[PDB]
Amino acid sequence: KLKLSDWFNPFKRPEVVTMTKWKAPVVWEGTYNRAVLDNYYAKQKITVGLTVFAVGRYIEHYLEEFLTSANKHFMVGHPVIFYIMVDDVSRMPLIELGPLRSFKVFKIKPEKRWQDISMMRMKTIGEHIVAHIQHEVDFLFCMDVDQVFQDKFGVETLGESVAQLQAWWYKADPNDFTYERRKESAAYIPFGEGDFYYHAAIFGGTPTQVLNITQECFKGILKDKKNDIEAQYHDESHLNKYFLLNKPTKILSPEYCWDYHIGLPADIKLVKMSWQTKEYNVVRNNV
Ligand SMILES: CC(=O)N[C@@H]1[C@@H](O)[C@H](O[C@@H]2O[C@H](CO)[C@H](O)[C@H](O)[C@H]2O)[C@@H](CO)O[C@H]1O
Ligand SMILES: O=c1ccn([C@@H]2O[C@H](COP(=O)(O)OP(=O)(O)O)[C@@H](O)[C@H]2O)c(=O)[nH]1
Ligand SMILES: [Mn+2]
């Protein structure tokens, strides 16, 4: 029976938000005791999954760097399975993996609009969870491919439902959050509501929770299509609506998904993951 106090110490980072009003911890560098967690999870012999999509030129531009960095930094010391979804398997970079890492690749259909490529991930992830992921891992993370692991991204991030604080808005007020503001959309969040602005580049939890996260998000995506509307920030707008209704049991600080374009302020102690510079002119084929 793992207890929050066993591994989480908010007092180590007094200058930032370390606890939500619903008692969920916000994991910042310095507040976690990975050694305690590694031993605890090793004894339970857990396996962690990681899904990543790479469709079109996202493959040549980001897949190798992502996987290479994941192999080295993701859940080191524990069995891990990388689930790679690509539209063209012949372009799969196939790198050498280290101890406790293995993978499996799936060929998927490339949607015509990049917006749909991004949103369809929700439907696809759920299908795979039902078909096999639920039987293969204890925890699963779903990530964007356009980023790179920079340091240990370990078990301190595991939980029932895990959300990521977006690097640009972690200190902003709810009314400045770029939530979908049109009531016609299923992702609508009225001003005066909201806890944080979560980044869709990273989210996870147990297979059961992620299944519900992805299922609900895609239901909203399909609903909007029937009402001839598309969320301003697509799947991210829907993810934020979901996490508003179903609070995450754990939140990761921006240190786990940092945009170096902002620079490196005092609150960012040790970057575990960083954004890749945007290259839409090459990787995207439509507006
Ligand atoms: C203050 C400000 O406008 N900052 C923006 C960032 O928000 C922006 O990042 C994008 O943010 C949206 C949600 O608003 C979504 O998370 C996108 O995936 C993310 O890239 C950034 C562009 O990289 O520019 C800043 O100026
Ligand atoms: O043409 C596309 C559009 C999106 N994606 C995937 O969907 C994620 C979301 O897209 P993107 O990174 O372009 O979103 P941004 O973070 O820049 O908003 C990407 O990381 C990829 O994993 C992809 O493979 N091909
Ligand atoms: Mn991205």
Side-chain angles (χ1 to χ4, degrees):
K1 179 184 177 59
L2 182 63
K3 289 160 293 181
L4 187 61
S5 291
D6 297 350
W7 68 275
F8 189 65
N9 186 339
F11 301 107
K12 292 291 184 178
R13 294 297 299 278
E15 261 67 293
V16 295
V17 179
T18 50
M19 282 268 286
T20 66
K21 64 180 181 180
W22 59 95
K23 314 304 178 298
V26 180
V27 184
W28 289 83
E29 175 56 29
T31 67
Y32 64 83
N33 191 322
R34 192 176 288 132
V36 165
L37 295 176
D38 275 323
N39 177 69
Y40 172 76
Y41 285 118
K43 290 189 176 184
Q44 299 190 306
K45 292 179 65 181
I46 64 170
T47 297
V48 186
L50 174 60
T51 66
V52 62
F53 291 67
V55 180
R57 302 309 167 184
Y58 275 69
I59 295 177
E60 294 94 321
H61 279 239
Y62 315 116
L63 192 52
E64 179 279 305
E65 280 176 72
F66 178 83
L67 294 173
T68 292
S69 68
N71 178 60
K72 177 184 177 181
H73 300 298
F74 189 69
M75 303 298 151
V76 177
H78 301 277
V80 167
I81 300 175
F82 297 141
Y83 302 102
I84 308 169
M85 270 57 66
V86 297
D87 64 309
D88 192 331
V89 182
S90 72
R91 294 155 66 196
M92 175 65 239
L94 290 184
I95 61 168
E96 182 176 298
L97 297 175
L100 299 178
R101 283 82 247 288
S102 66
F103 76 93
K104 55 201 304 183
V105 183
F106 299 94
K107 176 188 176 64
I108 62 172
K109 157 188 171 57
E111 305 295 341
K112 291 67 178 181
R113 298 173 63 246
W114 64 263
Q115 294 94 325
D116 288 302
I117 289 178
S118 182
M119 296 190 291
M120 272 294 285
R121 291 185 293 169
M122 293 301 195
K123 177 185 182 179
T124 302
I125 290 169
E127 304 180 320
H128 283 274
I129 289 182
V130 174
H132 63 95
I133 303 182
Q134 70 174 308
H135 310 301
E136 314 173 326
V137 306
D138 297 281
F139 295 93
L140 171 76
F141 266 103
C142 304
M143 299 182 188
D144 270 16
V145 71
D146 64 325
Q147 58 196 338
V148 180
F149 286 87
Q150 297 299 351
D151 217 304
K152 299 296 161 288
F153 194 117
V155 296
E156 71 283 4
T157 66
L158 302 177
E160 286 286 309
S161 53
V162 188
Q164 171 70 56
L165 283 184
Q166 211 263 33
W168 293 78
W169 310 94
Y170 82 93
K171 282 189 296 183
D173 295 306
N175 291 337
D176 283 304
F177 292 165
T178 59
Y179 289 154
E180 169 55 67
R181 303 298 188 178
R182 293 168 296 174
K183 64 187 176 187
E184 292 64 38
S185 174
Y188 175 62
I189 296 180
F191 291 95
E193 299 188 15
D195 304 307
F196 304 89
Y197 189 80
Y198 307 109
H199 198 181
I202 299 180
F203 68 86
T206 60
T208 298
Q209 290 308 307
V210 178
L211 171 61
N212 198 60
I213 291 175
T214 61
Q215 276 181 170
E216 288 304 302
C217 281
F218 199 61
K219 273 163 59 178
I221 292 170
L222 291 178
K223 187 171 195 301
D224 280 2
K225 290 183 181 301
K226 295 304 182 180
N227 290 313
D228 189 48
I229 186 171
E230 181 169 281
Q232 190 175 177
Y233 296 88
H234 319 92
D235 42 296
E236 191 172 79
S237 292
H238 289 280
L239 181 60
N240 272 283
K241 176 57 168 291
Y242 178 94
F243 279 147
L244 172 63
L245 300 167
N246 309 282
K247 316 296 190 192
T249 63
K250 175 173 293 185
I251 295 172
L252 308 186
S253 81
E255 297 165 316
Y256 286 85
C257 196
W258 190 247
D259 175 9
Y260 277 120
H261 180 57
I262 298 170
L264 192 62
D267 286 341
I268 313 304
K269 306 297 184 185
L270 182 59
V271 176
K272 297 88 177 64
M273 174 94 82
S274 61
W275 298 20
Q276 285 276 202
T277 302
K278 307 301 183 179
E279 294 174 286
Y280 298 159
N281 175 66
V282 177
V283 302
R284 293 183 173 177
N285 302 310
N286 68 286
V287 185

